[PDB]
């Protein structure tokens, strides 16, 4: 299982003065940190969210972000000034940073930046560069950000070393939570005729759900999207199109790792 660590930052600038920045952090599909605009410090959303970092290492790392957040806010504002009247508020910046962990001690880090909902910029190698499709005016911002050698060297440290190291630490510390198995519960219902198999409360995400006459997998089964529950489990429904009257005979089979080979079967 390849685990992706994600730092998601979203920043809104309404006008020249007003601004908020909120962040959430994910390891796979589990939230590990929240950092809202209102809060001076980064919140742990899991007991093991500090990973294997000492207190001193964490304090020094948080402090770096604390400065980054304030600095980022102003730099966007000065960039908007530098570009105007080409670009103007409201503005939405999103960042997606982190690493993907692989078997052995291999990994891969990324830092992607979105402007008004379009991916435009990334950190790659030693510098910022625009990705294909990006407007040319971004070349001024990029040139300016690349002048800052201090920021460059730090971001290279974060992506090349801090991320992988830290996530290895997170994977050890949070193993119990990551490997948890929660059993799904299912129930049935119809609607105008369409049949619905409700599966909810399962962890982890991979699940098998099919409509069945006896043991002939109905080809017509349509899976919905995976919808989350608050308690960090999943919900999913499979719908089957039918002619009224022919419901009797149909059953719902549900396979999931938590069931330990004891598939849930639910006849109508």
């Amino acid at each position: 299982k390849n685990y992706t660590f994600r730092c998601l930052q979203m920043s809104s600038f309404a006008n020249r003065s007003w601004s908020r920045t909120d962040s959430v952090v994910w390891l796979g599909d589990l939230q590990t940190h929240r950092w809202s605009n209102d809060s001076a410090t980064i919140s742990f959303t899991k007991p093991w969210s500090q990973g294997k970092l000492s207190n001193q290492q964490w304090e020094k790392l948080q402090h770096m972000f604390q400065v980054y957040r304030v600095s980022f806010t102003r730099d966007i504002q000065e960039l908007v000034k530098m570009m105007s009247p080409k670009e103007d508020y409201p503005i939405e910046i999103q960042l997606s940073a982190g690493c993907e962990m692989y078997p052995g001690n291999a990994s891969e880090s990324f830092l992607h930046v979105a402007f008004q909902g379009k991916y435009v910029v990334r950190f790659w190698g030693t510098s910022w560069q625009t990705v294909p499709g990006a407007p040319s005016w971004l070349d001024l911002p990029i040139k300016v950000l690349n002048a800052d050698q201090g920021t460059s060297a730090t971001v290279q440290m974060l992506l090349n070393d801090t991320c992988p190291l830290f996530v290895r630490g997170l994977l050890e510390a949070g193993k119990s939570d990551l490997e948890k198995q929660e059993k799904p519960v299912a129930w049935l219902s119809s609607v105008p005729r369409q049949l619905v198999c409700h599966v909810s409360g399962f962890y982890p995400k991979p699940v098998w759900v099919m409509w069945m006459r006896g043991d002939q997998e109905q080809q017509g089964t349509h899976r919905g999207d995976f919808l989350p529950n608050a308690d960090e489990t999943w919900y999913l429904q499979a719908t089957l199109d039918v002619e009224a009257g022919e419901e009797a005979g149909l059953a719902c089979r549900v396979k999931h790792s938590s069931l330990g080979g004891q598939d849930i079967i639910l006849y109508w």
Partner: T-cell receptor, first 111, second 113 residues
């Protein structure tokens, strides 16, 4: 990489218009205006990221800025007052951190 | 005012060495620069320090910077009469043009010939 200011010295009356000028031939996008008052450091009045753009600094009140071109940044005092007696410094720079400073301009505004 | 210099002023005999302090609260502190200013004149750069713990020299001028302490000093060796000037400490909050500079009020030096 040189920067010039004119006039280098100016005596003016209250309510008068004073224009302070800065010329820079280094093709620097960025220009800055400061005043120096004894017992303070230099303080930022206005600044500019390019032709046609001007921006307020920390102490912008009483001053208006004008950037007609890449080479000229100009500090305009519409209605001069004694409190604007000072020494004014102009600076320029590119994308990097260094600002290159002019030689200064002394202003005295008399009643 | 986030940049404080010490002493306010000092008087020194030609040939003697002197030391000037700068202490700041600027955040972040990308770099610190020392300027020399003769009365009636512009700002001439003596040195710029950029590393977390940094040392530099320029002739009879030398300087240290310690960013954890947010503290810098300027050493003038064997003062000459022309050293008579105000010495100005400046901290820049960015490694690029996006930064603001934060100026000290200066230290006034007088060298007695």
């Amino acid at each position: 990489a040189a920067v010039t200011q004119s006039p280098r010295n100016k005596v003016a009356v209250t309510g008068g218009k004073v224009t302070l000028s800065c010329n820079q031939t280094n093709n620097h996008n960025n220009m800055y205006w400061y005043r120096q008052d004894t017992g303070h450091g230099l303080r930022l009045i206005h600044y500019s990221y390019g032709a046609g753009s001007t921006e307020k600094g920390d102490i912008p009140d009483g001053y208006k800025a004008s950037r007609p071109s890449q080479e000229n940044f100009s500090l305009i005092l519409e209605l001069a007052t004694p409190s604007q007696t000072s020494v004014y410094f102009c600076a320029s720079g590119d994308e990097g951190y260094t600002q290159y400073f002019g030689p200064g301009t002394r202003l005295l505004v008399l009643e | 005012t986030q940049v404080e210099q010490s002493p306010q002023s000092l008087v020194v005999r030609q040939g003697e060495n002197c030391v000037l302090q700068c202490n700041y609260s600027v955040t972040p502190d990308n770099h610190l620069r020392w300027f020399k200013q003769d009365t009636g004149k512009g700002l001439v750069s003596l040195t710029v320090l950029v590393d977390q713990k940094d040392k530099t020299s320029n002739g009879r001028y030398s300087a240290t910077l310690d960013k954890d302490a947010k503290h810098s000093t300027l050493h003038i060796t064997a003062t000459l009469l022309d050293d008579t000037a105000t010495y100005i400490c400046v901290v820049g909050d960015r490694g690029s043009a996006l930064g603001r500079l934060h100026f000290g009020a200066g230290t006034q030096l007088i060298v007695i010939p």
